[PDB]
Design brief:
Chain C: Belongs to the disease resistance NB-LRR family. Chain C: This is Resistance protein Pikp-1. Chain C: It comes from Oryza sativa subsp. japonica. Chain C: Interacts with AVR-Pik through its N-terminal part containing the HMA-like domain. The complex is a heterotrimer, with two copies of chain A and one copy of chain B (about 80 residues). Chain A is an alpha+beta fold and about 70 residues long. Chain A has a single domain, classed as Alpha-Beta Plaits. Chain A is built from two helices and four strands. Chain A has a four-stranded antiparallel beta sheet with strand order 2-3-1-4, with helices on one face. The radius of gyration of chain A is 11 Å and the shape is globular. In chain A, about 35% of the residues are buried. Chain B contains no helices and six strands. Chain B has one domain. Classes of the chains: A alpha+beta (about 70), B mainly beta (about 80). At the B-C interface, β2 and β3 of B face β2, β3 and β4 of C. β3 of chain B pairs antiparallel with β4 of chain C.
Chain lengths: ~70, ~80, ~70
């Protein structure tokens, strides 16, 4: 069951690269992409990804983070 | 063993959202045996490692690919479904 | 690819090492997106701006495992 998760993150390229590396390091992730006109959203695609743990980790290490999409 | 792109499974690809969607699928063979496959643009060019060599591969408007491939190797293209 | 962005594809020896390679590439300045692709899911495709592919190869080799540049477009 292939998943797509879109997360909006507070990026206050420091926070962006840090956010991207964190997500990319997560188990089950096949792809990560920085999107939005403000380049403040990350699209993650993979299998077996836990979005709750991912949000918790972004909030702890990068900044506030919100789930926009899970499909 | 012959090549038949109408029966090849689609590549494992990712349409990066920050760039236009590429119009073509490419398939690389050695002795007519599939080695890998991916996406590429039409009416464009890329440098690709094909066996031992770096090969400059040009694509036309119909996803036909041309290049100087090493002996035994070929890269062939076709249009993706919506293109 | 057409436009301002670069696409590069790197094969990495990955057997832990998968997440490490992805994280390294994703942390690189100028990166917009990174994906694991290919028939053997052993190739990383990177899109962005101002990325030096040869420096990326050297960094992957130092930190992760062998790495080979396979496409620039």
């Amino acid at each position: 069951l292939k998943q797509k998760i879109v997360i909006k993150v507070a990026m206050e390229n420091n926070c962006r690269s840090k956010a991207m590396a964190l997500v990319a390091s997560t188990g089950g992730v096949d792809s990560v992409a920085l999107v939005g006109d403000l380049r403040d959203k990350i699209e993650v695609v993979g299998y077996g990804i836990d979005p709750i743990k991912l949000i918790s980790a972004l909030r702890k290490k990068v900044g506030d983070a919100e789930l926009l999409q899970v499909s | 063993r012959a090549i038949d792109l109408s029966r090849e499974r689609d590549p494992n690809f990712f349409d990066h959202p920050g760039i236009p969607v590429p119009e073509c699928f490419w398939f690389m063979f050695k002795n007519n045996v599939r080695q890998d496959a991916g996406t590429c643009y039409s009416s464009w060019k890329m440098d690709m490692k094909v066996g031992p060599n770096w090969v400059h591969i040009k694509s036309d408007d119909n996803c036909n690919l041309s290049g100087d491939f090493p002996p035994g190797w070929i890269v062939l293209g076709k249009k993706r479904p919506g293109f």
